Symmetry: C4
Subunit: 90 residues, 4 copies
Amino acid sequence: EFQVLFVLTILTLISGTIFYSTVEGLRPIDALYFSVVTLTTVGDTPPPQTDFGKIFTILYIFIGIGLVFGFIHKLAVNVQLPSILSNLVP
Amino acid sequence: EFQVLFVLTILTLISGTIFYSTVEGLRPIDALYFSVVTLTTVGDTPPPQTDFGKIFTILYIFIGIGLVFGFIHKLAVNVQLPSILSNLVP
Amino acid sequence: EFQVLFVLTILTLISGTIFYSTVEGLRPIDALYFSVVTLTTVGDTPPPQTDFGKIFTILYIFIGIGLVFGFIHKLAVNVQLPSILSNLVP
Amino acid sequence: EFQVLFVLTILTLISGTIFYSTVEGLRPIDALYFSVVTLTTVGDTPPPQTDFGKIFTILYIFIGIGLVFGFIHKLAVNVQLPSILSNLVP
Ligand code: NA
Ligand code: NA
Ligand code: NA
Ligand code: NA
Ligand code: NA
Ligand code: NA
């Protein structure tokens, strides 16, 4: 489960990194950052400047938001919860 | 269900596209983009400049956020989940 | 329930409108807009410029986000859902 | 539960405050603000300017978003709900 959401999240971010670095001309790290803050809805960066960028982003949001939060709802619910929960036991 | 959330999401975005292109003077694609990042809460674009735009946006957020995420909670929960889940079966 | 979440959401937004118009010097409509996009996490506007504004916003987010989404999870789950659901019945 | 989510949220924000004030050169209050709007997804501030800042932020989002909302889903669900609910009783 977690490992699978891990991989799926990775592929989604890799695709975003390749897309924005190519079409929006971003450095890879900036392309990855944009992909991450977009899918997590933080959206603290300027929007895409090209129409291709805008269209892809719209589809990217709809298809990737569900996956990213599903993964997050496990990274802390099935991995970080116990580590802290079990330790909260004297 | 999915098909219905599909259509409802479409109508909501169409209304947003017409509204922002007319009142905020955005090109249709930019009006659609603003509508999408607003309802998904990414909000990476500058806010509306007119009071009419601000008022509509406030109402648009409250009435459309629930629908958009409901749709998303199906596009990946009842459509993208199986496609990957079932295939995860040797 | 809905009517109560309605009122609670209203009071929260009224407080935000008064606060930002006074401390950040925003016109009331802009103060209301900032309050709304902040609590719904759209956050498409520039952040507060004063330290008082930043501190209040931090507390405002933590105390109001839960309420605002609870209300939203009813405005469409217990009000907009039936209207469309029941009508989907031939 | 609440008290524990309280503390965990605190530590996460303290780490963010120290990180951004040091690496991005922000005043402590601004570092705390950035940490808060990032983890709650409001993201109304300019993104980090350094690559170290971008990388940390990516990891910070994935590890802290779940915790922050879990806490929020208690600050109003197990603390602010009764206070208003019980009082709604004549
Ligand atoms: Na956001
Ligand atoms: Na945002
Ligand atoms: Na912004
Ligand atoms: Na958000
Ligand atoms: Na933003
Ligand atoms: Na800007």
